[PDB]
Design a protein around this ligand. Sequence first.
Ligand SMILES: Nc1nc(=O)c2c([nH]1)NC[C@@H](CNc1ccc(C(=O)N[C@@H](CCC(=O)O)C(=O)O)cc1)N2C=O
Ligand SMILES: CC(C)[C@H](N)C(=O)O
Length: 580
Amino acid sequence: MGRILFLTTFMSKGNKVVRYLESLHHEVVICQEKVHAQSANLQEIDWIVSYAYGYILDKEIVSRFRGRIINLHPSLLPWNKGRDPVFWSVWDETPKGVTIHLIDEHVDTGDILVQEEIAFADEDTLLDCYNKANQAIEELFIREWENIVHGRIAPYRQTAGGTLHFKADRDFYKNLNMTTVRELLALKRLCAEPKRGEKPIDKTFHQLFEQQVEMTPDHVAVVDRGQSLTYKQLNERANQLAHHLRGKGVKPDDQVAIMLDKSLDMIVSILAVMKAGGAYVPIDPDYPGERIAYMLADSSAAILLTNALHEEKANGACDIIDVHDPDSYSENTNNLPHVNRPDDLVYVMYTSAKGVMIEHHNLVNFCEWYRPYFGVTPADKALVYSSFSFDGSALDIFTHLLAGAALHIVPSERKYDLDALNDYCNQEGITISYLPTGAAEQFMQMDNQSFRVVITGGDVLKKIERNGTYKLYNGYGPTECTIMVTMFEVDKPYANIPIGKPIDRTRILILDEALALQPIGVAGELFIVGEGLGRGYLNRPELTAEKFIVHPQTGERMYRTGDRARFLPDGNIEFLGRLD
Ligand SMILES: Nc1nc(=O)c2c([nH]1)NC[C@@H](CNc1ccc(C(=O)N[C@@H](CCC(=O)O)C(=O)O)cc1)N2C=O
Ligand SMILES: CC(C)[C@H](N)C(=O)O
């Protein structure tokens, strides 16, 4: 009878479709390569049927075979045109079906002949779906072929719109072929790009702090032994120092070093640096004079806020401002005119070394997530415990100041004696704070009735047994992505205590060495994306590039931690040590 040219690159030479056509006494030429007009595969052809053909047809060919080129495409067009349609059908959660349509000059733009709705069960694998569709369309072709040959079907134009996908759009998703529909949608919900409608962060920390001063001005801000400052008192003194600093020429993105012990003067100095416009570099003065000398050299800091006592540990490296000299304080107590943007530096901290750069928007995002998460109110009282050279300090000070809470400085007297500290808290009625895993585990041993919440993380947490009523939370995150990026409420004991779910405006991805996504439950190198990412390492652009990358598929900016982890079925993340 008639000679049929069958085009495919993926499909077998013995498809149900080919056998049916041969059953009807058609000679079926099978071709899997691109062809041109001169091709001997185009001699004496009545119908062209194409099924997963991986090449376009020159206009020359489609015109000569107009009205006689059929394509088998397993999607409910115009949904899911182009490559890997069955997959994108699941991922993009489009309607699912199979379509036989004429071949137009453009990809999958030909008028429809027949169309069928298909269904996938939550339990089917993505390879199950791929087959179930090819099954459905092959059977459909056999049912309606006769109707197609005799030309008795009225082609109808495809509905406007649709989705289109390209060959390489699945690269990022190569490891997901054997995933379940349920398991695949779960992964999307955990790792898919942010939903539309969100706006950049438009505030700096000292903006929001000055905001909070006017709401709770007479509330206690910071306490150190018997001395205390209200938000109003604290704000005005920082302003006086900030005026002085901006007079000395502090400007946005400038570095100002602070070398002091935990004290009211420290909080004033920190806020004064921000309000002036710059970012503060905390230097614990117990560091070896070697480290201190380096931190001041690497840092471009021209100003140093410090004591008469620690003055000499800098060896005249820079201009010094005595926080105890009343001449370092201006008469003006007004808030300074704002000159900062959220992309300006807020602080620079050193890892165990390199200068990590953090911007205001990084810090704002963390505090704005912290307040509502832990339901912090001005009734709360928190401790300044961590060294002021670690990002754990930023949590202690900043989160609670924007909640109107009261900060209590922790002297070395009870820094180590947790029995004595606990007595502090029970007397003063402390309700919340962060303790590193080491210190936190110890504190579980002391009796406590003050706390409402305690937070840990930084090293692996292994014990949960606590005496007090308070809830307990384990967190995770590197200094490079601003304090912590994930948070878990500990409800029951675990052999591996999970580190929780991501915070506001942050996303975490588990990737192959190839940087491809990994199914829920499969380990990989944990990657961070979102508001938390800092500016990088100071004076270390080549190394910054190493750790702050532009993903090859998505083009998003991500931080490579070098930690192993995996997602649990309920959405929480599980730490699995370093990558080695
Ligand atoms: N002329 C024509 N119209 C069609 O509608 C049609 C055909 N040919 N041939 C088979 C199928 C389309 N199949 C495909 C699938 C992918 C590519 C492809 O190579 N896409 C590249 C684009 C890059 C480039 O243009 O070089 C990609 O990266 O996604 C081509 C044809 N098809 C009807 O079903
Ligand atoms: C100390 C902790 C809050 C910090 N994210 C770290 O791991 O260094």
